[PDB]
Design a protein around this nucleic acid. Structure first.
Lengths: 171, 150, 139, 126, 52, 149
RNA sequence: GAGACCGAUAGCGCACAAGUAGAGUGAUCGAAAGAUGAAAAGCACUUUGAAAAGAGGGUUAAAUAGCACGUGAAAUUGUUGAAAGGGAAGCGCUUGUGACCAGACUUGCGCCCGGCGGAUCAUCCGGUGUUCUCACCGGUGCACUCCGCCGGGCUCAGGCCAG
RNA sequence: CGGGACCGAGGACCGCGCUCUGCAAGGAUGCUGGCGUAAUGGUCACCAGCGACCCGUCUUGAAACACGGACCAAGGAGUCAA
RNA sequence: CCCACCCAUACCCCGCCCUCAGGGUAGAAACGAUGCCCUGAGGAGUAGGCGGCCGUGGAGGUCAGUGACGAAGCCUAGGGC
């Protein structure tokens, strides 16, 4: 398997991934963008607060005609939500990466989320019945998630130019 | 802009054969040289007829040649830039010196049996490079089924 | 007769097995072709009298057509190897190209081809190292 | 070696001729197509529109098919192909074909160095 | 299937073409221009004894 | 342009704007130029105008081709049957309207002049006597020739 | 038994458990769907998870081939990097900025000296071949003659932009 | 008699000539400087000045109306015989 | 009424491309003669007509053609014609 962030070596990093996960891709993208670049313990605490509705995930791209809340002011937005299922899936993947880091021997308390990325998985094809004997798609849009944690960390001058510089150096 | 009521006209005659015959190409090269380097009008007419298509080169028969060999032409070299055919209505072939693009087998046999000579056009170029003492003959152009139907 | 150099040139002027045609020019692989160019002047396999020069181990090897052996391919070529001073090779090649009327139009090309082969037989000089330039290549 | 002396290379136009509306439609390739609609502004040559190619943009006959060094490219597949440029090292440069293997490329480059023939892509597969 | 697959050719033109090809086979430059390796052939046309 | 003025301009060999020709004045030519006056300016040229036109913009029609008059050999080969063997003979024939004026004038290719340095009058397409540029301006054509040649 | 036929939206509707699955009361209608790898060698063992799985570690020539499997385009999407944005963008001509690049060049030829290393210098003789007067081969050179190399010096020609 | 701009096509000789040891006479040479690399040149992105209707179809004389076009891939229409 | 000035793809001069036209070029040291050399004129285009070229699948011949030391295909703010 190849991760999208190929620049990060696996010597001092810990990676986790999950595929074909039946959780909303848009909600998961917003949650991952909320915790992108953070320390690991801060991300875990924030995701538990999201589950407990104590902190909100700001809705930036996939936010059309959503609601407004006072908990978006920490992010400078008005539109923010609490994607509990996305938070649960991301907590599971973050704890798997923590276990990988502990097995590898790294320092858990100094790790940051260097890379985190949500991609669209193949869609689940249910159907729904509409009026006048019609059938419409009722699809699920699942996601692939991957994350990587890392340790926190005068040539070719002209002769006139040369002569000017020599004279200034002498005087 | 310039007002040009009249129009420059591109050439409406053949400048080269459409044929891919290599020996005809060699003949055309030879007569291009002759019509460029001599003053004889014979060579220019011969070059133009070497350019021509087959409906523009109707066959010439031996009876037509014998008709034109009368009245002081008995010693002139006959030049035809088409096929010379035999006419079996002509029972007696006179002695004649004929240079043609090609001959039929019976026409060549009857000319040689009457004691004349058959030449190709390059032999004609060797012996008469200015077309001196020649009789240039064409066949009937409008003697065609389509031309009747025109 | 039915066969001549002009006839063979008309037969093979548009295609033959020696032809190398590309966008930037038409070349010939003919052994009797000095300058390796497709034209009647240089079509040595077409012409009755013709010259060709190939490298040897040291020096040049010159072949010429023999006009009396055109129907005998194994004995149709007069072959001389010049492995001596370049000036002597040029003198003999120009002599067999011009002194007896055997393709005096080819003597410049023949001397040039011999000179090119002898120049290619010299040892090559080492090229200077490539200078790295810019920012991405330099660093 | 250096190319034969030649007149300066003049390109009348260096920009390509882009197809109309190929910048707005991804199903339209940018390769030139002449517009044939009767009311098309590019075909009618309104100013401010894309130019259409014509024979007036043709290159000088003395410098046509010349690379900026002054040589003409000749595609070569082997040593016998590059040996055809023995008499033309001042006018023709060898371009090795893309499907030639690395060892054969080394042989071609060595022979072309002996013959004094420029190789346009001599650093490939190294 | 009733496409015209076969070509009727005059027998006289077939005989003409065969004779021209036979005449071209006796011209050693044309053998090389067709790509035959005939540089060691002692004579063209090459005639071997029927006893062999 | 209507077909009769178009035909007269063609017969005067005035097919492009700022083309100039020499005309010998007869009634048969004067009436033609009178008809094409909405398109032309004409007048009576002096010796300086004739010599500067022939020296700077002189071209002969040799076998249908437009040849610059850079040597007296071209003039002698094309006009020597009439006794015109040099460029001064050509200028004299044109200026004095000699017995071979027709041959000399027709041998001269129609002169291709530039636009005038200084421009035309503000309303160009009126008659000269009304403050424009069209028609017969007599000896004043020399200033226009000096501006355009 | 063959073909100047088609090459998985083609070619029979069907290259596959296809006149099958499925639809229709019925007569009838009627698909989609091929390819891991040479070999399953189809991931032992450890670890985290309830599990699916993940990470180590393995197999393989390659998992950038993991029974979603050869190759793996585009629409469309995510991350990273760069940039622009006062009621559209996109496009043409021409500069500039930033980023990134292809060439060209690196020295050659010819003389004059000095030092080396060799005699495929000129002439003549014999043989052979040729275009029948030109060559090659064997002997002859005895180094003020030829052929390379190495040091200098000189002339000429050399890349880009300019006065 | 000055002042300025743009341009240097051709490539042995031949010609017309002149002010005739030679020349401004059938098309640029001579002298000199810096640099020899991203400096010139090129590509891409963006800003700036100016320029710039959305294609196809249909109709008549023309516009307008009207019709088709969410996007991409592959398929897709003057053939064969007499 | 007067003087100067501004700019079109118009006019003039110069270069380059194409088309058309007219010449030259073999006792060939001679040429993709289907070539090359010299000279002149011309350049918008719907219906319509004609020429030359580019590209795709397959067939004969040929290149003693390329290729596991990597063919075909695909991607490319990388180049050349």
């Amino acid at each position: 398997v190849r991760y999208a962030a190929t620049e990060i070596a696996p010597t001092k990093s810990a990676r986790a991934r999950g595929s074909y996960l039946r959780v909303s891709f848009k909600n998961t993208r917003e949650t991952a963008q909320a915790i992108n670049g953070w320390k690991l313990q801060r991300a875990l605490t924030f995701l538990q607060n999201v589950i407990d509705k104590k902190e909100a995930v700001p809705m930036r791209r996939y936010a059309g005609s959503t609601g407004r809340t006072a908990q978006g002011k920490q992010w400078g937005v008005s539109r923010a939500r609490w994607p509990v299922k996305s938070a649960q899936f991301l907590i599971g993947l973050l704890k798997n990466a923590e276990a990988n880091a502990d097995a590898k021997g790294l320092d858990t308390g100094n790790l940051i989320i260097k890379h985190i990325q949500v991609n669209q998985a193949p869609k689940q094809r249910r159907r729904t019945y509409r009026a006048h004997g019609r059938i419409n798609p009722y699809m699920s849009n699942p996601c692939h998630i991957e994350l990587i944690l890392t340790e926190a960390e005068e040539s070719h001058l002209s002769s006139r130019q040369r002569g000017v510089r020599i004279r200034r150096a002498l005087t | 802009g310039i007002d040009l009521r009249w129009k420059h006209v591109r050439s409406s005659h053949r400048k080269a054969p459409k044929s891919d015959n290599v020996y005809l190409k060699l003949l055309v090269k030879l007569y291009r040289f002759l019509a460029r380097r001599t003053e004889a009008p014979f060579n220019k007419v011969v070059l133009r007829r070497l350019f021509m298509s087959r409906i523009n080169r109707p066959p010439v028969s031996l009876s037509r040649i014998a008709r034109n060999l009368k009245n002081g032409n008995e010693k002139k070299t006959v030049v035809v830039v088409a096929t010379v055919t035999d006419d079996n209505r002509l029972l007696q072939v006179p002695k004649m010196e004929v240079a043609a693009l090609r001959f039929t087998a019976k026409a060549r046999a009857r000319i040689e049996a009457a004691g004349g000579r058959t030449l190709t056009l390059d032999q004609l170029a060797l012996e008469k490079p200015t077309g001196a003492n020649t009789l240039l003959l064409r066949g009937p152009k409008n003697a065609r089924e389509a031309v009747k139907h025109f | 007769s039915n066969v001549s150099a002009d006839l063979i040139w008309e037969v093979s002027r548009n295609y033959n097995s020696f032809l190398v045609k590309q966008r930037t020019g038409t070349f010939s692989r003919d052994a009797l072709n000095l300058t390796n160019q497709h034209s009647r002047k240089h079509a040595g396999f077409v012409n009755d009298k013709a010259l060709g020069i190939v490298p040897a181990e040291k020096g040049v090897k010159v072949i010429a057509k023999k006009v009396k052996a055109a129907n005998k391919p194994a004995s149709s070529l007069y072959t001389v190897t010049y492995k001596s001073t370049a000036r002597k090779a040029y003198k003999a090649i120009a002599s067999q190209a011009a002194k007896h009327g055997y393709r005096a139009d080819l003597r410049q090309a023949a001397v040039a081809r011999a000179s090119a082969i002898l120049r290619s037989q010299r040892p090559v000089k080492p090229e200077p190292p490539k200078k790295l330039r810019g920012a991405a290549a330099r660093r | 070696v250096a190319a034969k002396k030649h007149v300066p290379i003049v390109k009348k136009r260096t920009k390509r001729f882009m197809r109309h509306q190929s910048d707005r439609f991804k199903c339209l390739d940018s390769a030139w197509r002449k517009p044939k609609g009767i009311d098309n502004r590019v075909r009618r040559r309104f100013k401010g529109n894309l130019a259409m190619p014509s024979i007036g943009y043709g290159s000088n006959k003395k410098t046509k098919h010349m690379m900026p060094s002054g040589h003409k490219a000749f595609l070569v597949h082997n040593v016998k192909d590059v040996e055809l440029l023995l008499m033309h090292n001042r006018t023709y440069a060898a371009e090795i074909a893309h499907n030639v293997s690395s060892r054969k490329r080394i042989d071609i480059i060595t022979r072309a160095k002996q013959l004094g023939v420029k190789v346009t892509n001599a650093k490939a597969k190294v | 299937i009733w496409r015209k697959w076969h070509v009727k050719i005059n027998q006289g033109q077939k005989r003409f073409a065969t004779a021209s090809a036979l005449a071209a086979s006796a011209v050693a430059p044309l053998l090389m221009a067709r790509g035959h390796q005939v540089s060691t052939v002692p004579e063209v046309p090459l005639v071997v004894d029927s006893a062999a | 342009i209507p077909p009769k003025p178009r035909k007269i301009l063609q017969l005067l060999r005035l097919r492009q704007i700022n083309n100039g020709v020499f005309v010998k004045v007869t009634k048969a030519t004067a009436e033609m130029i009178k008809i094409v006056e909405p398109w032309v300016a004409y007048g009576y040229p002096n010796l300086k105008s004739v010599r500067e036109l022939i020296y700077k913009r002189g071209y002969g029609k040799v076998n249908g081709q437009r040849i610059p008059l850079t040597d007296n050999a071209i003039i002698e080969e094309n006009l020597g049957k009439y006794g015109i063997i040099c460029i001064e003979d050509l200028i004299h024939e044109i200026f004095t309207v000699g017995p071979n004026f027709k041959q000399a004038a027709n041998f001269l290719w129609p002169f291709k002049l530039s636009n005038p340095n200084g421009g035309f009058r503000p309303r160009k397409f009126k008659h000269f006597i009304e403050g424009g540029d069209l028609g017969n301006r007599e000896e004043h054509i020399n200033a226009l020739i000096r501006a355009m040649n």
